[PDB]
Design a protein around this nucleic acid. Structure first.
Ligand SMILES: [Mn+2]
Ligand SMILES: [Mn+2]
Ligand SMILES: [Mn+2]
Ligand SMILES: [Mn+2]
Ligand SMILES: [Mn+2]
Ligand SMILES: [Mn+2]
Ligand SMILES: [Mn+2]
Ligand SMILES: [Mn+2]
Ligand SMILES: [Mn+2]
Ligand SMILES: [Mn+2]
Ligand SMILES: [Mn+2]
Lengths: 86, 94, 105, 98, 79, 100, 107, 94
DNA sequence: ATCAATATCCACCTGCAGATTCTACCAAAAGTGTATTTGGAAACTGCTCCATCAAAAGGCATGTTCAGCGGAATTCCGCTGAACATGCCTTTTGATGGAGCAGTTTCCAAATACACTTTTGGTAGAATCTGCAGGTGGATATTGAT
DNA sequence: ATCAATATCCACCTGCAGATTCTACCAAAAGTGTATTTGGAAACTGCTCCATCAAAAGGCATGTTCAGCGGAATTCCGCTGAACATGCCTTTTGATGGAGCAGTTTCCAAATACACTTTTGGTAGAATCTGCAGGTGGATATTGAT
C-alpha cells in the first residue's frame, strides 16, 4: 500500500549522463542549454513509446507492461529493436 | 470492367457537411485513396493486434485499439466515439 | 433494411465487411468490426470534407479541388500528422516564406 | 599541477564511449522516469524488468543517433559546440517536428 | 542527354515553390543527381511489379505500389 | 522614356509567392517522359507506360524535390546564408537518412 | 523418410517455415515451394551476418560472438547496414567515428 | 509454456562458417529477432504482391519478387540463387 | 519627399471541358435462415516474477574555481548569381491511323488443404564444460610545459 | 627538441557466471487418399499506347552588367572544459508477501459456407447542366530612382 509519489524524475537524467551519450554520439563541445533541451526530447520520446506500449498492455487486459509490449510499440513507430523477443 | 470505389459515399457525406459544394473528379480520386489508405492501416494494425494476442477474430475491440494507436489525439477520441455510437445504434435495431 | 442504415451510416457496412474478410486479416471477422470501421472512415472523410469545404469557400469557389484538400490537411495539426507521409497530387504547398528572406522594411 | 587543454579530455571521452556498449544513463533514475510517465497515462501498472531495459536501450540509441545528427548541424554552421538550435534543425529535418 | 533535359529554370521553379530565394550555380547538377537516384529507386520497384504480373506496360498502380513501399505514399492515381 | 530594373532578390520573392500559390507541374513533360523511359530501359527493355504512370512519377518526383528544397533552405539559413549550396542538400539528405 | 529441409539441402526448417506462413494469414494458400525458398533466404542472410560477426569476434580476440560483433558486422557492411537501417541492436554501441574538424590542430 | 526459436539452426549455420566460434545468449536473441523480422518483411511483401495480382496463393515466385523488392542489390542476387537452388533441388527428389 | 515603370487587384463576361443528374442494363453483391463448429470468456488455481526495502560499499554526481579558446560582431570587398533583354529551338496540343497487349471466358490438370494417424526433431530441465571480466603491473605512447 | 605527468595498450592470471552437453516427453512434422480448385494456356477483341506532322508561341539558352552576399581576417568577452573535494545515492544481493498471469476444463453466444433472393452500385449513351479559367478595362499598390 501507499507507493511514494513520483515527481521531477526527468532530473534523474543527469548532466553527466547526457555528456556521455553525446560523446558516444561524437560530440566534442556542449552548450549549457543542451541538457534541458535533451531532457525535453527524451520525455517526448518516452511518452510516445510508453503510450503505445500501455495501449497494447490494456488491450490484452493485463496490468503488467511486457517487453513484447515495448518491442511492438517501438516497431510501430519505426524504431525496431532486436534483443528482447522482438 | 466494374471498378468499386467509395465515390458515391464520399459524395453523400459531402452533401451532409456542405450541401452546396461539389467536388472535382481528381479530388474524388484523392478522397478514394484516403479511405483505402486508412482502411488498410487500421485493418493491418487490427490484424497484428489479434495475432499478438493469439485470437482468430478481428472485433470492434481490435478496430478500436487500432484507431487509438493510429490516429492523433482528438481525431482518435472522436473516431472512437463515432465507432462506438455506430455499434450501439446497430445493436439497438430489429 | 440496410446494414449501413441500422448503424446510422452513409459508408457501406457490407462492403467493408467483405473487404475485411477477403483481406487476410484474420480467420474470422466479428459482426461489429465492419460497423465500427465504416463509421471511423465516414467520420474521417467528413472531417476532411468539412475543412476542404471551408477552404473552397475562402478562395471563393464552390467546387472542392485537390488544392483545397491540401490546404485543409496541412493547416490542421492532426490531419497533417496522420497524412505526414502522404502526397496529395496537384496539391501544391502552403504559402510560407522564411522571415530572414523578407526584404528589410 | 598538470592540465590537459580544453578538448583533449573530451576527445578521449569520445574514444572511450564509442568503444563500449554499456548503457550510459543510471539504471534506477531511468526506471523512476519510466514509471512516472507511465503512471500519468494509467495508474496501477507493473513492469517486467526487461520492459524497462528495452525502453532504456531504445532511448539511449535514439539519443546517441540524435546527437550525431545534431553535431553535423553544428559543424555545418562552422561550430564544434552543439546548441539547442542544432537539435531542433535535426528533429525538423527528420520529420519529428513541424 | 536526358537528365540534362531537366533544365536550370525548371530546377529553379521547384526551388521557388520550396521557398528558396538564392541558388548557387553548383545546385543544378546536384539536383539532377538527386532526381535520378530518386527515379531509379522508384522505377526499379515499379518495373519489378510490372514483371511480376508478366506485363510489358508499367501501370499507375505499379508506380503507386512502388511509392508506397518506399514510404512516399501518393494519392490520386488509384489504389 | 524607360530604363528600369528590380533589385536582386525582389523578383526571386515574387516567383516564390507565385509558385507557392499554384499547383501545376514545374518540369516540362516531354523531357521528363524521356528521362523516365530512359531509366526504365536500364531495368527492362521495350516497356510501355500508361500515361497516368508517367504522371504519378512526375507528381511524386516534384513533391519530393520541393520538400527537399525546403529542408535545404533551412540548412542554408542555419549557417547564416540565404543561398542554398550542394552542401546544404547533402546535409538535408544525410539527416533524412537517405545517406549523404 | 527424409525431412523437407534435408531434401532441400538446408539447415533451416522448411516445415516450421511452412506452418508459420500458414498461420500468418498471408494468403489463403501456400505453395509447397514457398517455404523452401523462404527458408533458404533466411539461412543465407544468417550465414552472411554470422560470417561477418565471427570475423569481428576474431578481430577483437574473442571466441564468442556478442551483440557488439553483430553491430560491427552490420554497420561496416553497406548492404546489411541498409537492410537493417531502421533497426536497433541492443548492446551494440556504434562504430568509432570522429569528425575531422574535431581533431587537434595541424595538417 | 514452450516457445520455438531459430536458435538451433542459427547455431548449425554458425558451426559451418566458423567451426570454432561460439555465440552468447544475447547475440542469439538478436539473431532470432533478425530472422523473425526478415520473415515478416518478406512474407508481408509476398502477401501484398499476391493481393495486387488477385492470386489466393503465395508461391516461390512471390517470395522471389518480395526478396527482390526487399534486399539491396547484391544480397538480393545471392538470396535468389540460394532460393532457386533449394527449390530446384527439393523438386528433384521424392 | 517626388515621378514613373510595373505589378496586382477587382468587377464583369462567357464558352466548354468536365461535373451532376437521367436511366436502363445486369452481373454482382449484400444479406437471411439454417445446421455445423468453434473461438474464447468466468471460475478455479498453480506459482512465476514483480514491488519494495535494507545493509554495505564505493562509484559517480554536485558544486566551485580558473582560464583557454570558441563563437560571433564588425568591416571589407571580390566575384558569384539575379535581372533582363535578344534570339530561336523545342515543347505542346490535337487531329490520326497501326498495333501492342491487356484482360475476360472456358476448359482442365497440377497442386492445395484438412482429417488420419505414425514417428521423431525440438524443447525444457539436469548435468557438464570453459571464455573472458577484471585486477596486477609494467613497458610504450601521448600531451603539454619550457 | 628535452623531460615529466599521465594515459594507453596488452599480455599473463583466475574464479565463475554463463554456455555448451547430455536426457526422457510431446507438440508437431510428414506419408495417403480423396474432393476440390486455382490459375495457366490459348484464341480474341479493342482499349489506349506509340510515333508523328503542323501549326502557334511559349519557354530555354546566351550574354551583359552590377548589386550585394558570403567569407576571411582580426579581436575579445565570457562560456564551457578540466580538475578537485566532498559525500550522496546507485548498485548488488538477498528476503518476503502476493499481485497476476497463464494453462485446463466446461459450454454458450457468435461466426462461416452454402444456397437462395432482391437491389444497390457501376456504367455509359445522353445530354442537359454549369463553375470558373481566361481575357479585358481601369483603379491603386509596390518598388526603386532621384
Ligand atoms: Mn504523476
Ligand atoms: Mn574562433
Ligand atoms: Mn510483330
Ligand atoms: Mn531424436
Ligand atoms: Mn580485460
Ligand atoms: Mn477460377
Ligand atoms: Mn553579409
Ligand atoms: Mn554531494
Ligand atoms: Mn440503385
Ligand atoms: Mn480569373
Ligand atoms: Mn489595364
Amino acid at each position: 500500500r501507499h507507493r511514494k509519489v513520483l515527481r521531477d524524475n526527468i532530473q534523474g537524467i543527469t548532466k553527466p549522463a547526457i555528456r556521455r551519450l553525446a560523446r558516444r554520439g561524437g560530440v566534442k563541445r556542449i552548450s549549457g542549454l543542451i541538457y534541458e533541451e535533451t531532457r525535453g526530447v527524451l520525455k517526448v520520446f518516452l511518452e510516445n513509446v510508453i503510450r503505445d506500449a500501455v495501449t497494447y498492455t490494456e488491450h490484452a487486459k493485463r496490468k503488467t507492461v511486457t517487453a513484447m509490449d515495448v518491442v511492438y510499440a517501438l516497431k510501430r513507430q519505426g524504431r525496431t529493436l532486436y534483443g528482447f523477443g522482438g | 470492367t466494374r471498378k468499386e470505389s467509395y465515390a458515391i459515399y464520399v459524395y453523400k457525406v459531402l452533401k451532409q457537411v456542405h450541401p452546396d459544394t461539389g467536388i472535382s473528379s481528381k479530388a474524388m480520386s484523392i478522397m478514394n485513396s484516403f479511405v483505402n489508405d486508412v482502411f488498410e492501416r487500421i485493418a493491418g494494425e487490427a490484424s497484428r493486434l489479434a495475432h499478438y494476442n493469439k485470437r482468430s477474430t478481428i472485433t470492434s475491440r481490435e478496430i478500436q485499439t487500432a484507431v487509438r494507436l493510429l490516429l492523433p489525439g482528438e481525431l482518435a477520441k472522436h473516431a472512437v466515439s463515432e465507432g462506438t455510437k455506430a455499434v450501439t445504434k446497430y445493436t439497438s435495431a430489429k | 433494411k440496410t446494414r449501413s442504415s441500422r448503424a446510422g451510416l452513409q459508408f457501406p457496412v457490407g462492403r467493408v465487411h467483405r473487404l475485411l474478410r477477403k483481406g487476410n486479416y484474420a480467420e474470422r471477422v466479428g459482426a461489429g468490426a465492419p460497423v465500427y470501421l465504416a463509421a471511423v472512415l465516414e467520420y474521417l472523410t467528413a472531417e476532411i470534407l468539412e475543412l476542404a469545404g471551408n477552404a473552397a469557400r475562402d478562395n471563393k469557389k464552390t467546387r472542392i479541388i485537390p488544392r483545397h484538400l491540401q490546404l485543409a490537411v496541412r493547416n490542421d495539426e492532426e490531419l497533417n500528422k496522420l497524412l505526414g507521409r502522404v502526397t496529395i497530387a496537384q496539391g501544391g504547398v502552403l504559402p510560407n516564406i522564411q522571415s530572414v528572406l523578407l526584404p528589410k522594411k | 599541477p598538470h592540465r590537459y587543454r580544453p578538448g583533449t579530455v573530451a576527445l578521449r571521452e569520445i574514444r572511450r564511449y564509442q568503444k563500449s556498449t554499456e548503457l550510459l544513463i543510471r539504471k534506477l533514475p531511468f526506471q523512476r522516469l519510466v514509471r512516472e510517465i507511465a503512471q500519468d497515462f494509467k495508474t496501477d501498472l507493473r513492469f517486467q524488468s526487461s520492459a524497462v531495459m528495452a525502453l532504456q536501450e531504445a532511448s539511449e540509441a535514439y539519443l546517441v543517433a540524435l546527437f550525431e545528427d545534431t553535431n553535423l548541424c553544428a559543424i555545418h554552421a562552422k561550430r564544434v559546440t552543439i546548441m539547442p538550435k542544432d537539435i531542433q534543425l535535426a528533429r525538423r529535418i527528420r520529420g519529428e517536428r513541424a
